[PDB]
Short mmCIF file of C-alpha atoms in Angstrom, two decimals:
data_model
loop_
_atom_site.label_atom_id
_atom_site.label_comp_id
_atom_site.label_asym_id
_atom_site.label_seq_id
_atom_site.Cartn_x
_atom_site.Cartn_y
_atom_site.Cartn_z
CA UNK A 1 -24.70 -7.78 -21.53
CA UNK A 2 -28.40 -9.37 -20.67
CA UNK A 3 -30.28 -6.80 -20.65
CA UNK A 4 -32.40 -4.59 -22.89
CA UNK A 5 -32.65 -1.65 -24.17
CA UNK A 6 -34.26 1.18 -26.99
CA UNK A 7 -33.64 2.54 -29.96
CA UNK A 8 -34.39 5.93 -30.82
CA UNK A 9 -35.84 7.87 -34.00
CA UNK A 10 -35.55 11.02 -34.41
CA UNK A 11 -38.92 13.07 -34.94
CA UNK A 12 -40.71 14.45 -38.07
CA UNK A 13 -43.58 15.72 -38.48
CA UNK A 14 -45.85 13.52 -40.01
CA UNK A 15 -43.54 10.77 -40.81
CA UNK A 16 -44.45 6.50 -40.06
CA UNK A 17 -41.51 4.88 -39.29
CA UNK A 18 -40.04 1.31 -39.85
CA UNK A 19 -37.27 -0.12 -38.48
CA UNK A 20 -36.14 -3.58 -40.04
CA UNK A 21 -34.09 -6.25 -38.40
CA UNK A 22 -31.20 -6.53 -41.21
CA UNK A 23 -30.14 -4.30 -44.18
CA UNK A 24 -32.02 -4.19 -47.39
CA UNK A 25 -35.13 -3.83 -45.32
CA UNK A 26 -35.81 -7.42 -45.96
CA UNK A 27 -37.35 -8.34 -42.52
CA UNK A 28 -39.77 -5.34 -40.40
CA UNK A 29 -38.78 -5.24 -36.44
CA UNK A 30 -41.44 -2.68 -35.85
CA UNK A 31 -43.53 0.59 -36.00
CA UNK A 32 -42.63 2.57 -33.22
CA UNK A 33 -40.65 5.49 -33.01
CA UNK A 34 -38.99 4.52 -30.18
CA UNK A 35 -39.17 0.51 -29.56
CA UNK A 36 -36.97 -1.50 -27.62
CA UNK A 37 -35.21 -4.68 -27.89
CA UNK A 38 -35.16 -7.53 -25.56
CA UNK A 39 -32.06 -9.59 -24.63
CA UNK A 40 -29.19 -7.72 -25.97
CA UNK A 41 -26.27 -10.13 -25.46
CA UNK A 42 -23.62 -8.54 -28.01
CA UNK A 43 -23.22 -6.06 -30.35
CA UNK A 44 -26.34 -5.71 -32.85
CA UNK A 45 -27.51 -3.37 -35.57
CA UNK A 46 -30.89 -2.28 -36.27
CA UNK A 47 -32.02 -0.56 -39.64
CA UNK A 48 -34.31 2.47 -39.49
CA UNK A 49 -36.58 4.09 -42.61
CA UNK A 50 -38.43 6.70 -42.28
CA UNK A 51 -41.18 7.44 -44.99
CA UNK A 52 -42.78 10.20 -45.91
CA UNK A 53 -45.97 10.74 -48.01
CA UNK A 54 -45.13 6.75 -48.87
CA UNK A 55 -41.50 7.85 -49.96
CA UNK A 56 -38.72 6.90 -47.56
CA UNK A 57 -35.36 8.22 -47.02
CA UNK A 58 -31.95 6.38 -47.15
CA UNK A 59 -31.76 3.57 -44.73
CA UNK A 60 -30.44 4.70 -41.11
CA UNK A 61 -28.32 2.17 -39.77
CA UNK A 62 -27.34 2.38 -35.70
CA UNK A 63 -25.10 -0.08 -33.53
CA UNK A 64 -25.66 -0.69 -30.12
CA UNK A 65 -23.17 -1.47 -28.25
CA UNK A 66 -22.82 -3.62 -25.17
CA UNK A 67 -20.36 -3.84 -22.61
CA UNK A 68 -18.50 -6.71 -21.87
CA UNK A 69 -19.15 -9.04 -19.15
CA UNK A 70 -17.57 -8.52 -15.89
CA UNK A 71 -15.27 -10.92 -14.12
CA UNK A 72 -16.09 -12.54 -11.18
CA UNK A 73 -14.44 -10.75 -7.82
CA UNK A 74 -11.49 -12.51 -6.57
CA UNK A 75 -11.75 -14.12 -2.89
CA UNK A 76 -8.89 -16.15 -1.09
CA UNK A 77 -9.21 -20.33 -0.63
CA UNK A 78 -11.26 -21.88 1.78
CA UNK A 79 -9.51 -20.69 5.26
CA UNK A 80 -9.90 -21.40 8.89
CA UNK A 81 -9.54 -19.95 12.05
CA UNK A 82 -10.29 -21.01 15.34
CA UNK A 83 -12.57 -19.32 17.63
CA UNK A 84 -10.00 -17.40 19.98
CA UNK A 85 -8.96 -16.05 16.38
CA UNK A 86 -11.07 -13.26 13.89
CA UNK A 87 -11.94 -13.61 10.39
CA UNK A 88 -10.79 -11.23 8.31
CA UNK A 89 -12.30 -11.44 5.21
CA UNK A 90 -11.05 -8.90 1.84
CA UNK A 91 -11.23 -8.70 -1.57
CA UNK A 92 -8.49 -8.11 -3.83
CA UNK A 93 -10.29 -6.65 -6.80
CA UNK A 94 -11.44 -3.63 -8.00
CA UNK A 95 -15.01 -2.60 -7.54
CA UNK A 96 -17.16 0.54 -8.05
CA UNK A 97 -19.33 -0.92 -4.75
CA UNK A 98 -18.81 -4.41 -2.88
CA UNK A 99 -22.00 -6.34 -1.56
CA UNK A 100 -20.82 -8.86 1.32
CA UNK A 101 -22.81 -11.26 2.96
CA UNK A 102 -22.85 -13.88 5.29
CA UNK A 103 -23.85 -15.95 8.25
CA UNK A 104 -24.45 -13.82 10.91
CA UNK A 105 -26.59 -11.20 9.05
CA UNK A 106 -22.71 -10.02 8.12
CA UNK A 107 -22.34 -7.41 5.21
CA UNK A 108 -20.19 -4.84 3.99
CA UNK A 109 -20.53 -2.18 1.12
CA UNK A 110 -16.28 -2.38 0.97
CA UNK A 111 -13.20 -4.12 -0.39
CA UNK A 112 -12.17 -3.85 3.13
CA UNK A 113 -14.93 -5.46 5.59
CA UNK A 114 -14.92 -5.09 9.27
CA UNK A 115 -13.32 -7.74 10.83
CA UNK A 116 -15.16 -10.02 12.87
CA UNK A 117 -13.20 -10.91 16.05
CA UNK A 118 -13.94 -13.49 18.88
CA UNK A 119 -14.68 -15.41 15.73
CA UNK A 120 -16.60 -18.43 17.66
CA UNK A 121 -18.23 -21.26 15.73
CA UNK A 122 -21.20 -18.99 15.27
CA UNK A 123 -19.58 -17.69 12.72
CA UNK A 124 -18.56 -20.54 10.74
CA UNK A 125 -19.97 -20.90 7.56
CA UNK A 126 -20.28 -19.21 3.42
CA UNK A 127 -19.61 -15.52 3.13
CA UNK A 128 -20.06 -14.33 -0.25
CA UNK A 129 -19.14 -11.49 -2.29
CA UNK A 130 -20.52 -10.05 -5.41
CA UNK A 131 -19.30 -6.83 -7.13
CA UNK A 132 -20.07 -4.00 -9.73
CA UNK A 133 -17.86 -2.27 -11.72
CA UNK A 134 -19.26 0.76 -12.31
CA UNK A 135 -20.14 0.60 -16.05
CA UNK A 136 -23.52 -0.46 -13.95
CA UNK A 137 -22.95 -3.92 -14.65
CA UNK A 138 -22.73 -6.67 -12.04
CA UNK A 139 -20.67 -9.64 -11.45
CA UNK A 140 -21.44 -13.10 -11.02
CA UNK A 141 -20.64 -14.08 -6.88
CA UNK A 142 -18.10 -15.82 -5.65
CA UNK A 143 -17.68 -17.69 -1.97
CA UNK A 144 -15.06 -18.54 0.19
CA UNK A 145 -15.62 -21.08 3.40
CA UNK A 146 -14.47 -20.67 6.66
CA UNK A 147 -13.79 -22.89 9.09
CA UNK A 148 -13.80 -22.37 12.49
CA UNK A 149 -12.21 -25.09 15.08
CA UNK A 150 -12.45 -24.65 18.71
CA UNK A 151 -10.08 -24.82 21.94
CA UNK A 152 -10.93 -27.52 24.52
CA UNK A 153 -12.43 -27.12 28.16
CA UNK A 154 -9.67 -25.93 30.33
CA UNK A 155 -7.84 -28.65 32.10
CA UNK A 156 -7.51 -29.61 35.87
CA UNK A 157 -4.39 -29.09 37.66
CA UNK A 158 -2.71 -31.61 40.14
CA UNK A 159 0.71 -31.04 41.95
CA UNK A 160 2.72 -32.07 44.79
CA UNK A 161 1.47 -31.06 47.96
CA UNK A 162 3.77 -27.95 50.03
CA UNK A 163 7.26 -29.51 48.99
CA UNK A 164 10.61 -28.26 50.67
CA UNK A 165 13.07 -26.18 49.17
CA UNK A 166 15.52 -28.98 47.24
CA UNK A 167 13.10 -31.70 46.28
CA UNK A 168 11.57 -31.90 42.91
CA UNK A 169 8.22 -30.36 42.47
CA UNK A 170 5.91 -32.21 39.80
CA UNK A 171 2.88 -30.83 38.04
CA UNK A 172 0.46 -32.62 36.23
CA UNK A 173 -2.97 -32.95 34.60
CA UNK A 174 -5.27 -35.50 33.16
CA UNK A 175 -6.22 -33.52 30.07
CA UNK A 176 -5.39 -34.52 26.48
CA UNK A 177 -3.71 -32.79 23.49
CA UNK A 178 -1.10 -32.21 21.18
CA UNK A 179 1.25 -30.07 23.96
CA UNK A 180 0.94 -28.53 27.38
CA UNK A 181 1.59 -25.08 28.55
CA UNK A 182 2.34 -24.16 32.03
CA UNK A 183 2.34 -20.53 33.44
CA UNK A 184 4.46 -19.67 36.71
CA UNK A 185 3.25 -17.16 39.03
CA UNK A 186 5.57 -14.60 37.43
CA UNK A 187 5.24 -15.43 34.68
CA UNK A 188 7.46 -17.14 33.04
CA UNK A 189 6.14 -19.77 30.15
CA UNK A 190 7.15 -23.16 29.74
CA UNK A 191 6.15 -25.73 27.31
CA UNK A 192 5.49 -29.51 27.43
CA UNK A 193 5.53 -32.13 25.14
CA UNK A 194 3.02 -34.57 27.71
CA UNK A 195 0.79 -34.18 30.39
CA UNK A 196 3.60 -33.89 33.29
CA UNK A 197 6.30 -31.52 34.66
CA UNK A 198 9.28 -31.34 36.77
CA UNK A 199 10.66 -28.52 37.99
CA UNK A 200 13.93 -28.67 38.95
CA UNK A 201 15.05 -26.60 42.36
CA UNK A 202 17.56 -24.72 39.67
CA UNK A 203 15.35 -23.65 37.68
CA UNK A 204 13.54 -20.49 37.09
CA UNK A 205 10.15 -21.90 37.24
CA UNK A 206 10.77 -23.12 41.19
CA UNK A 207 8.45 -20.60 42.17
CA UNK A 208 5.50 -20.77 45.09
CA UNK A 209 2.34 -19.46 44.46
CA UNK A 210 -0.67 -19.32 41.85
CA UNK A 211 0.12 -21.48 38.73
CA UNK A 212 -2.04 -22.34 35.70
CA UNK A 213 -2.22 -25.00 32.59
CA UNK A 214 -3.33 -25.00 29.58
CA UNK A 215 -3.39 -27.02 27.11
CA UNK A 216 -2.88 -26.89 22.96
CA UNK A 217 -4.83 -29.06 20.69
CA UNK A 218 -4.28 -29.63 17.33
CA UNK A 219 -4.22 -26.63 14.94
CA UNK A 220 -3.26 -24.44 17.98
CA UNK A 221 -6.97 -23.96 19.95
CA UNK A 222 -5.37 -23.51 23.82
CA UNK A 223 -7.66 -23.99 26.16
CA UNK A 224 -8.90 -21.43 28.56
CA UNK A 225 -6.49 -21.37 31.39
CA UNK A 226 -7.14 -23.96 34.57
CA UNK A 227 -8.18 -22.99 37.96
CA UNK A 228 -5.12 -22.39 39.53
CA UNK A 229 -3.29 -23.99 42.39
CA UNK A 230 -0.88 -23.13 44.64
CA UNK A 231 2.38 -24.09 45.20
CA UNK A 232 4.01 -23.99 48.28
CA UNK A 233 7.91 -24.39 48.98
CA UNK A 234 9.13 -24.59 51.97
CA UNK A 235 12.15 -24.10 54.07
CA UNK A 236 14.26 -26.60 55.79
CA UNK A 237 15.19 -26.02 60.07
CA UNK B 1 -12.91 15.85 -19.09
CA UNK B 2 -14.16 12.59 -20.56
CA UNK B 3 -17.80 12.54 -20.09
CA UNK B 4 -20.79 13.00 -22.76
CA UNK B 5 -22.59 16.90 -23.06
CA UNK B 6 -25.61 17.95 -25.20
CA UNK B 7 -25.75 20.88 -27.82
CA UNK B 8 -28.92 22.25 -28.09
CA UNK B 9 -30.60 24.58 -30.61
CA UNK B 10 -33.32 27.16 -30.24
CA UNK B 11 -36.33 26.37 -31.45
CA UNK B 12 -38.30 27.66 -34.70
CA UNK B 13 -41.67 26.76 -35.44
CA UNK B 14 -41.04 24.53 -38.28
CA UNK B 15 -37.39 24.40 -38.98
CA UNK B 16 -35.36 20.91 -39.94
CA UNK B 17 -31.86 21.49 -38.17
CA UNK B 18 -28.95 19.61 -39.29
CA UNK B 19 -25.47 19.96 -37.11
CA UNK B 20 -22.04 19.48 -38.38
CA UNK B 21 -18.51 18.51 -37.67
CA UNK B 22 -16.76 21.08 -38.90
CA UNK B 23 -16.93 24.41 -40.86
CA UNK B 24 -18.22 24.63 -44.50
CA UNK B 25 -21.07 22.25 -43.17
CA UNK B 26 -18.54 19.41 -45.24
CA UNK B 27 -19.55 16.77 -42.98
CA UNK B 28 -22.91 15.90 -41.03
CA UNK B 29 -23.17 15.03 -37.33
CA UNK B 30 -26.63 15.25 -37.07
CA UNK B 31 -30.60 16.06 -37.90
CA UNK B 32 -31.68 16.56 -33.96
CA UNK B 33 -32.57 19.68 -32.64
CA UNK B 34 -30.92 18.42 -29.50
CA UNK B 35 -28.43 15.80 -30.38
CA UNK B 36 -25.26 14.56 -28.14
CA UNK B 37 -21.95 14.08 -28.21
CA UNK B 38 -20.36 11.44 -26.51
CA UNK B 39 -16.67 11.16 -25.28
CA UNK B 40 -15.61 14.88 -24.85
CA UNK B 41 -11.73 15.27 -24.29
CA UNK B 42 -11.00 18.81 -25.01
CA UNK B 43 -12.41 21.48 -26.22
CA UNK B 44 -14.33 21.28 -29.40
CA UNK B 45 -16.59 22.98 -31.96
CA UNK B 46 -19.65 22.32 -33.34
CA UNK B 47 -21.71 23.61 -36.44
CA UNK B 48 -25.49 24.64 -36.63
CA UNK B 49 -27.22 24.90 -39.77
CA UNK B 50 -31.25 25.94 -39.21
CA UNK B 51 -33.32 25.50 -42.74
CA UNK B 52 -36.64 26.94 -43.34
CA UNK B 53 -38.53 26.32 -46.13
CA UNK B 54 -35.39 24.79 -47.87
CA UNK B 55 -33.34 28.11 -47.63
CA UNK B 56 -30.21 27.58 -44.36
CA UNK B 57 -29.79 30.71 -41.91
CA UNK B 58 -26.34 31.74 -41.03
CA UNK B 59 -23.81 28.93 -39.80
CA UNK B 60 -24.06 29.08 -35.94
CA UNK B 61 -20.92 27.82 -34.68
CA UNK B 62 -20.95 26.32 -30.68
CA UNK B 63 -17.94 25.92 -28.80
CA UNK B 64 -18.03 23.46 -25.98
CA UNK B 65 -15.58 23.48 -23.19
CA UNK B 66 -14.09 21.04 -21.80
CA UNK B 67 -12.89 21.40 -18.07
CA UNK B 68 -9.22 20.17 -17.06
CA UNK B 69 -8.47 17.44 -15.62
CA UNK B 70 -8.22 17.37 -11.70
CA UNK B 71 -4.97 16.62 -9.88
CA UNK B 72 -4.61 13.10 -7.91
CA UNK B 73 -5.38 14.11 -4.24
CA UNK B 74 -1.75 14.20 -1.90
CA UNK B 75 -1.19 11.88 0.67
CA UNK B 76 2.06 10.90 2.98
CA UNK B 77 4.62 9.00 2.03
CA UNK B 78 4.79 5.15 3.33
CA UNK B 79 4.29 5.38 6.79
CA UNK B 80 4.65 2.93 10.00
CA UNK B 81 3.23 2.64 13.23
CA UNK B 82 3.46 0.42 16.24
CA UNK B 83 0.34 -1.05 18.05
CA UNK B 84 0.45 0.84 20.81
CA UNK B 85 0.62 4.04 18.59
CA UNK B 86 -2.41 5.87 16.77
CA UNK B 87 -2.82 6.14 12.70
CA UNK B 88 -3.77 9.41 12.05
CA UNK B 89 -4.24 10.03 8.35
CA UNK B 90 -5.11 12.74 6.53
CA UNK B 91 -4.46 15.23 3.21
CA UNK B 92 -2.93 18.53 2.48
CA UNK B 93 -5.29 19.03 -0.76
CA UNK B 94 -8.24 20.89 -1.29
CA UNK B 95 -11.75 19.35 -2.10
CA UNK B 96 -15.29 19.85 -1.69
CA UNK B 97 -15.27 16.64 -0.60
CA UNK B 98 -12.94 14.01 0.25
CA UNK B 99 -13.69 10.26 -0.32
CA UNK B 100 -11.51 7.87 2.39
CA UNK B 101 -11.39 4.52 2.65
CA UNK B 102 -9.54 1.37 3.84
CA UNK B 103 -9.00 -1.97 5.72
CA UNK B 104 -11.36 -2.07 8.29
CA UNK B 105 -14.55 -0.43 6.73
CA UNK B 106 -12.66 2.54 7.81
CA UNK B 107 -14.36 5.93 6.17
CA UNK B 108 -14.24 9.18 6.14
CA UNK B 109 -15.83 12.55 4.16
CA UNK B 110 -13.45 14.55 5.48
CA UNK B 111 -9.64 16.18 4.79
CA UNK B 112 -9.00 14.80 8.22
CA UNK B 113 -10.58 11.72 9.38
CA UNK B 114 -10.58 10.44 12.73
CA UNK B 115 -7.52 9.44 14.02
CA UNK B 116 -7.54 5.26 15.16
CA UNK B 117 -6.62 5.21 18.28
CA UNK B 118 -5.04 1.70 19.11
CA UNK B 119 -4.08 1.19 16.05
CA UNK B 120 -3.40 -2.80 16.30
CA UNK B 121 -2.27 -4.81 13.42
CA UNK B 122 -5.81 -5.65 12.09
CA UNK B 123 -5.80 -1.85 10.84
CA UNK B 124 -2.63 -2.56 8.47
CA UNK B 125 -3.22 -1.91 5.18
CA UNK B 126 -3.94 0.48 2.47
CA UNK B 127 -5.36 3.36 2.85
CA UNK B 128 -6.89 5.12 -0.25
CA UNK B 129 -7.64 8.25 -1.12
CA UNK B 130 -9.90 9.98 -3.60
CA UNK B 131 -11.01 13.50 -4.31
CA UNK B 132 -13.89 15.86 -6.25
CA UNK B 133 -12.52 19.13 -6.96
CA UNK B 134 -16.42 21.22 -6.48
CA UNK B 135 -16.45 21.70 -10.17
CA UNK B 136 -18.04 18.35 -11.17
CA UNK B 137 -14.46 16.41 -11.42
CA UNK B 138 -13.44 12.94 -9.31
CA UNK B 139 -9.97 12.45 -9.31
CA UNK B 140 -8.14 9.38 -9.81
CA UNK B 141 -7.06 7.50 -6.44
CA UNK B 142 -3.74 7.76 -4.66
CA UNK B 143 -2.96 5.36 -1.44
CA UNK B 144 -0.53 5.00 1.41
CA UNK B 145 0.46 1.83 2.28
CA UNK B 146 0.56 1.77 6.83
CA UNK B 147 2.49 -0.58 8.38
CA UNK B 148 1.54 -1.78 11.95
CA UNK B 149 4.38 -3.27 14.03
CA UNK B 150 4.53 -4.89 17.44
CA UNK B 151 4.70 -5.27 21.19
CA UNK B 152 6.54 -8.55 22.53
CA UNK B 153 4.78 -10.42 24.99
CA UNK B 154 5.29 -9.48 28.92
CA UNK B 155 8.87 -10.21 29.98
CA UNK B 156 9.12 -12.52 32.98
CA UNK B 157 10.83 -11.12 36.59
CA UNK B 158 13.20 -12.92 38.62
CA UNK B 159 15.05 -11.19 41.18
CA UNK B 160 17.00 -11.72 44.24
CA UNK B 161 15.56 -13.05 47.52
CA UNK B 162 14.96 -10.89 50.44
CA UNK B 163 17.88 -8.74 50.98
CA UNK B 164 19.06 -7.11 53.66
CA UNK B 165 20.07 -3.57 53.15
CA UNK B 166 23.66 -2.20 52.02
CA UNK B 167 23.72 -5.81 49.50
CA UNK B 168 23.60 -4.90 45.76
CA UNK B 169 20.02 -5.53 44.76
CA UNK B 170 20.25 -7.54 41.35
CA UNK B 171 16.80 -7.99 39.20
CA UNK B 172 16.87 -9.42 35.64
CA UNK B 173 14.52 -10.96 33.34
CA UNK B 174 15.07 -13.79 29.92
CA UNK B 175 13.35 -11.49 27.80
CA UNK B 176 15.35 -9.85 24.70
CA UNK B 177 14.80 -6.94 22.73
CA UNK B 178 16.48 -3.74 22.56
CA UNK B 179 16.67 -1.99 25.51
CA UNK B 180 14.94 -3.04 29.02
CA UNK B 181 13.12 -0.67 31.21
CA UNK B 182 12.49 -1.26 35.18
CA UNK B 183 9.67 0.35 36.97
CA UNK B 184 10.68 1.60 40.67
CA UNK B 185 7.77 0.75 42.85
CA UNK B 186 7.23 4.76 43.10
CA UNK B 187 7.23 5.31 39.84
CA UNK B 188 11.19 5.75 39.20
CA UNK B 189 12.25 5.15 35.25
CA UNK B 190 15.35 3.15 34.44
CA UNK B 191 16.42 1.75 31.18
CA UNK B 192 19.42 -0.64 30.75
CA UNK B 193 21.37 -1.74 27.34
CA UNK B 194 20.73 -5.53 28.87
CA UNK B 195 18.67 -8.35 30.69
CA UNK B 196 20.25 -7.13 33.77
CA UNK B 197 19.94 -4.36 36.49
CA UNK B 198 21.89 -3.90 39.38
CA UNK B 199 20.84 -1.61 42.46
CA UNK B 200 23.51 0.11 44.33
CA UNK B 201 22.06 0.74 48.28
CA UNK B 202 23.21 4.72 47.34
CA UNK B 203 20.28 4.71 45.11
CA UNK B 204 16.81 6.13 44.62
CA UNK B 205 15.94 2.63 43.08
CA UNK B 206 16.81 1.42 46.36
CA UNK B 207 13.28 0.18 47.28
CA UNK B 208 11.67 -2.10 48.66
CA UNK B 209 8.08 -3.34 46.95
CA UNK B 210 6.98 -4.16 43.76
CA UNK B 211 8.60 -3.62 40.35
CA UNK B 212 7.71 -4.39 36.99
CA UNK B 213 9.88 -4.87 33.63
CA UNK B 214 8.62 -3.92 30.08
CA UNK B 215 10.99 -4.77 27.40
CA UNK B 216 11.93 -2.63 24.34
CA UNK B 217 11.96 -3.92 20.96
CA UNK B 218 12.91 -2.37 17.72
CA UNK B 219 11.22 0.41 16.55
CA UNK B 220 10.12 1.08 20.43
CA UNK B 221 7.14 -1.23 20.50
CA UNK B 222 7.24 -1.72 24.19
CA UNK B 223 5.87 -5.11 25.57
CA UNK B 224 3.01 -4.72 28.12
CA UNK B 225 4.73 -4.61 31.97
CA UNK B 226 5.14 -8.32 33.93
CA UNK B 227 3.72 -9.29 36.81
CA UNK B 228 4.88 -7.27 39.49
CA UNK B 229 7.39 -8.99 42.39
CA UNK B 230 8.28 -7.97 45.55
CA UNK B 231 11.92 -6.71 46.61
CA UNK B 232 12.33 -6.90 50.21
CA UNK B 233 15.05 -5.02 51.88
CA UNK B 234 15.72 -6.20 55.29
CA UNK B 235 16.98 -4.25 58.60
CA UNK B 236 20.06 -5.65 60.59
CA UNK B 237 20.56 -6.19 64.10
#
């Protein structure tokens, strides 16, 4: 459906031909053995005579037939991802051959493109899809955003200086966000719902040595992990 | 099966040619020397009158054949794989050529592709299939749906203190899952129906250094090892 496309007369010797845009012969299309049409956009018919020594034969009638229009390829709704996540992009249609595009000079010939991981902010933007369905027709495009949010800087790290074995040891940092995640040296992973922790000498997270933060913003986005510090507990004479 | 063939007639200097449906020339197909016929299923027949001078030759009937239909290509039934396991895929037909396909661009010519190693849950998906038999004949798709399960993340380790030897050595972790599985600083295996392990001083797991835990989920899908500690097993005076 668009496009155009011939019509074709058989051949005798000697013979004009005429073709004629209705039945009856009421309205001449042309002269040529083989013309085309332009801009075929449903089902048409076209009349052919064929005269000989100025007598013609019985009208020729053809049909020619064209394919329906394709549907659009089907792509998910606008998604998002944040840049310690990929983008995994699919279509759930049926295609003879895919042609992806997008941002990053992305493409793919499949239903099934590569996935694009470490999906920074580079990558935010329109990717695009347009299909055929192997009748050789095309199909208009369709687009899907993404979205890509980001994790802030990592945060600093303050704690008690070396504390003895007994007393409560207190972490803390000066970074902002929806929750806070602290990592013990063996470990073991605790959550927080504000910027400061106790650690009580029951616990499991008493521990000495390297600890890091980090912290969660909204729609997930953890920071890279902080420097870390040291803790230091110490025995009592 | 189910594509479009020409006939096609000698030539004689000056002959009309006229082709027909069936026998007893009862019902004209066509006036082409050449002519086609679309939408072959099975086998069919076809008749060919050749007139000279107004007086028809022989009826020259034309058989055309139709080839069978191929068989769908065989794949495995649904299978499953963890993400620290491999996908190999492949077929037990026979093809001169094979047409693969699936979820990450993944491709392959071949009755056995190459085998993804690390097979992580982005590769989850269906697979698809599709064959040509070396006789000119696709045949339609088959698929096999692969599931990609998972590691949990890194247990934590706590154990006891430094120990003197001939105490029961006692290491556990807050991890669940399945089954739990300590790693002897050289190298010893042990697996335990729960969180916790206890070392008898008889032992070959009697050692001093540093063990790891890696916890067992269903479907084995073993979580990476923890972070090492450090049994110490002290002398007495």
């Amino acid at each position: 459906t668009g496009t155009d496309a011939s019509l074709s007369a058989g051949t005798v010797s000697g013979a004009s031909y005429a073709w004629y845009t209705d039945a009856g012969t009421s309205n001449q299309f042309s002269t040529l053995q083989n013309p085309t049409v332009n801009n075929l956009t449903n089902d048409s018919t076209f009349y052919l005579l064929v005269t000989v020594n100025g007598c013609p034969s019985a009208l020729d009638s053809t049909t020619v037939v064209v394919y329906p229009l394709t549907p659009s390829p089907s792509l998910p709704a606008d998604f998002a991802v944040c840049e310690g996540d990929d983008i995994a992009l699919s279509t759930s249609t049926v295609a003879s051959s895919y042609d992806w595009s997008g941002p990053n000079g992305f493409t793919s010939n499949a239903q099934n493109p590569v996935v694009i991981t470490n999906a920074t902010g580079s990558n935010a933007g329109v990717y695009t899809l347009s299909i055929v369905d192997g009748n050789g027709c095309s199909s208009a495009d369709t687009s899907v955003q993404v979205t890509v949010n980001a994790a802030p800087a990592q945060p600093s790290m303050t704690t008690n200086s070396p504390i003895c074995n007994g007393a409560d040891l207190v972490m803390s940092t000066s970074a902002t966000g929806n929750s806070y995640i602290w990592r013990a040296p063996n470990g073991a992973d605790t959550t927080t719902a504000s910027s400061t922790l106790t650690i009580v000498p029951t616990s499991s997270l008493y521990q000495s040595g390297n600890w890091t933060l980090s912290v969660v913003n909204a729609a997930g986005c953890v920071s890279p992990a902080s420097i870390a510090s040291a803790v230091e507990i110490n025995s009592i004479p």
